[PDB]
Design a protein around this ligand. Structure first.
Ligand code: 9H4
Ligand code: ZN
Length: 197
């Protein structure tokens, strides 16, 4: 009992910058500082933007702020706290059945607005700041206009699918893979986030 370890916090280590005309990834914390912040849960770094790059000791993925909540996938975050300036913050939403978790959005982040356009021309944002056109094909699936090896999408779970006007349509969850090629993606629809709320 006395030696049982604690899992560390999820740590914001960068962001996907969408503020201007060029999308690009920014790193805001290196691997050593990430490891230390994960164990303490105390992250005093400035947060900006809608799409964060996040890490645990063993994985790296994305998280997206919608309606004042920073959302990501359960398969990346599990039940972990997130590091914050005052110490670890507990998830306010956890739904393993949806592969969904959420924490209160960090001070300084910006939130996306849920889409009400009813449009099926979407855009997936990856951890490399690629903006991938995706045609919506059902409630929780979309096809890539240009299929990509799954290598290209790995590490982008938790990222957004957006409509043409930049509203949030969903959270990227899984790639639909044939012979290692992603022809489609599965996502958590923003309406499911809204119901979880
Ligand atoms: C533990 O509790 C849970 C609860 C719910 C759950 N729901 C799940 C749906 C679930 O799927 C598993 C995780 C998820 C996954 O790899 N996502 C990311 C990603 O980038 N991840 S990540 O950032 O690298 C990482 C790994 C966090 C750091 C987006 C894709 C990028 C590339 C695809 C690589 C090859 C895997 C292809 C799987 N295709 C797949 O299953 O397709 C369907 C059509 C669904 C069969 C798939 O995509 N997969 C399996 N695992 C869970 C686990
Ligand atoms: Zn919209």
């Amino acid at each position: 009992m006395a030696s049982m370890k604690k899992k560390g916090s999820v740590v914001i280590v960068g962001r996907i910058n969408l503020s201007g005309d060029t999308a690009y990834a920014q790193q805001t914390r290196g691997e050593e500082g990430c490891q230390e912040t994960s164990q303490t849960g105390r992250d005093k770094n400035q947060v900006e933007g809608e799409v964060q790059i996040v890490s645990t000791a063993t994985q790296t993925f994305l998280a997206t702020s919608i309606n004042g909540v920073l959302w990501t996938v359960y398969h990346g975050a599990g039940t972990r706290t997130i590091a914050s300036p005052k110490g670890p913050v507990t998830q306010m939403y956890t739904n393993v059945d949806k592969d969904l978790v959420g924490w209160q959005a960090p001070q300084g982040s910006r939130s996306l607005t849920p889409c009400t356009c009813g449009s099926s021309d979407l855009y997936l944002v990856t951890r490399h700041a690629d903006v991938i056109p995706v045609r919506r094909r059902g409630d929780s699936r979309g096809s890539l206009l240009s299929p990509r090896p799954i290598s290209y999408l790995k590490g982008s779970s938790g990222g957004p699918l957006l409509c043409p006007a930049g509203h949030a349509v969903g959270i990227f969850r899984a790639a639909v893979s044939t012979r290692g090629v992603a022809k489609a993606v599965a996502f958590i629809p923003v309406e499911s986030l809204e119901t979880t709320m």
